[PDB]
Design a protein around this ligand. Sequence first.
Ligand SMILES: O=C(NCCOc1ccccc1)c1nc([C@@H]2CCCN2C(=O)CCc2ccccc2Cl)[nH]c(=O)c1O
Ligand SMILES: [Mn+2]
Ligand SMILES: [Mn+2]
Length: 179
Amino acid sequence: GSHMEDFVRQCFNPMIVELAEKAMKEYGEDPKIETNKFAAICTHLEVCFMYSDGGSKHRFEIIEGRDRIMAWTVVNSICNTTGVEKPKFLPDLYDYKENRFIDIGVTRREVHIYYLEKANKIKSEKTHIHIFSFTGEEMATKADYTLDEESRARIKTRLFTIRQEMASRSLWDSFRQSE
Ligand SMILES: O=C(NCCOc1ccccc1)c1nc([C@@H]2CCCN2C(=O)CCc2ccccc2Cl)[nH]c(=O)c1O
Ligand SMILES: [Mn+2]
Ligand SMILES: [Mn+2]
């Protein structure tokens, strides 16, 4: 019964918490034990949702937060109708405006490092990458940040708020060192 599990539950909204614990279940991890990862997935989820709200009405298709079969199902439907490369790994969103998949990263480390690590792993030329940090830095593929500045700023604000809430509860160091 960790302080972190209770913090997560009153910091993120119940829909986010539900989706996160389900995602961990499907991959056989326990939110009760792997608490830092629990917080990370909720954070990643909330960022993806704020991101998808950033655009026009139906600009983004949300792939993160689905179960794996349905997520892949939507990917092939997008691919088989837009003639776009089928990625090796599940992206987080699809941008109908820019006709590309997006994987969103959230890191406690330096954004350059995390970006470099992600590009190698995804091993998809076409997948756009957009990294946010808890300190307010962002790095996006080809310097193309997709959204306007204000949508990205509220994401960065929320991320820094989470960091303060954690640190005020002494969970930040453990969370920072866990990545
Ligand atoms: O979609 C992603 N992974 C597919 C699902 O993998 C799970 C694996 C275990 C449980 C539940 C799910 C994804 N993974 C990652 C990173 C590096 C690769 C593995 N990883 C993580 O396990 C970190 C925690 C995480 C899990 C899921 C979603 C977001 C995060 Cl942060 N970073 C993304 O930005 C991203 O989108
Ligand atoms: Mn994802
Ligand atoms: Mn992601």
